[PDB]
UniProtKB/Swiss-Prot annotation:
The protein's enzyme class: hydrolase
Outcome after substituting residue 52 to P: In SCN1 and CH
Tissue: Bone marrow cells. Neutrophil.
Effect noted on mutating residue 17 to F: In CH and SCN1
Domain of life (superkingdom): Eukaryota
Subunit structure: Interacts with NOTCH2NL. Interacts with agaphelin, an antihemostatic protein from Anopheles gambiae.
Residue ranges of domain Peptidase S1 in the record: 1-218
Record keywords: Cytoplasmic vesicle, Disease variant, Disulfide bond, Glycoprotein, Hydrolase, Protease, Serine protease, Signal, Zymogen
Phenotype for residue 14 to L: In SCN1 and CH
Descriptive protein name: Neutrophil elastase
Compartments reported by the entry: Cytoplasmic vesicle, Phagosome
Source organism phylogeny: Eukaryota, Metazoa, Chordata, Craniata, Vertebrata
Residues with glycosylation annotation: 59, 95, 144
Amino acid sequence: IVGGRRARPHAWPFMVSLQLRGGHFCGATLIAPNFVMSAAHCVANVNVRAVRVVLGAHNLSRREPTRQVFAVQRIFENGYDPVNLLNDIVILQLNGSATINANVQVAQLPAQGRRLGNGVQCLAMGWGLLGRNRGIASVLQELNVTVVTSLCRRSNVCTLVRGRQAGVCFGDSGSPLVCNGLIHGIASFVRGGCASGLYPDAFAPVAQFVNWIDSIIQ
Ligand SMILES: *[C@@H]1O[C@H](CO[C@@H]2O[C@@H](C)[C@@H](O)[C@@H](O)[C@@H]2O)[C@@H](O[C@@H]2O[C@H](CO)[C@@H](O)[C@H](O)[C@H]2NC(C)=O)[C@H](O)[C@H]1NC(C)=O
């Protein structure tokens, strides 16, 4: 997240950090006790058994007894196309079920086919780079964004921060876009580099996949 702010500790208890070699590299969302939802490009070419799924985190730079750490046991995709970044969504089956407490909870999702209009106020978040060569974020970041259709495909939900250069950046892939309490997006791609002020950020449109998601998780 470039141009955002620290989230309050555990303000988004569904927020998930995907990790390799002990380092964060993608976000995800908890959609059931034993399932997380991320971008398909995040796990396309990784050792799935080497990934660790970290729930309940806030400062990746510390030790937090609030964390619950899981492995991945099975992958579910839905026609992902890496050339054009279509259907950029995956479901991760965990090696167990999380404990729902203050700092770990299941997110709410929209109805199948729901499509957001221009100007809807949303919130992006993640542990990705802060921009300006400040490096990767330590504490979870959040950013106020607006839904836009200009320079966006109908196969995405895109967002933009009007008037300044801010947006998602490297490491935010897979993170949720929250609009009115529901998860409508999964971070998929930027254009013109991060925080360009020229192109909106593009999210996989969760609403288009809710029937498929249910069929995985009940
Ligand atoms: C679910 O997975 C977690 C993650 O640990 C990794 O994946 C496991 C399959 C196993 O290979 C671990 O050793 C891997 O590091 C498991 O958490 C680990 O559990 C062991 C034994 O209790 C413990 O010594 C490690 O410190 C734990 N690692 C972390 C990062 O917490 C967990 O036990 C698995 N649960 C089930 C039911 O399989």
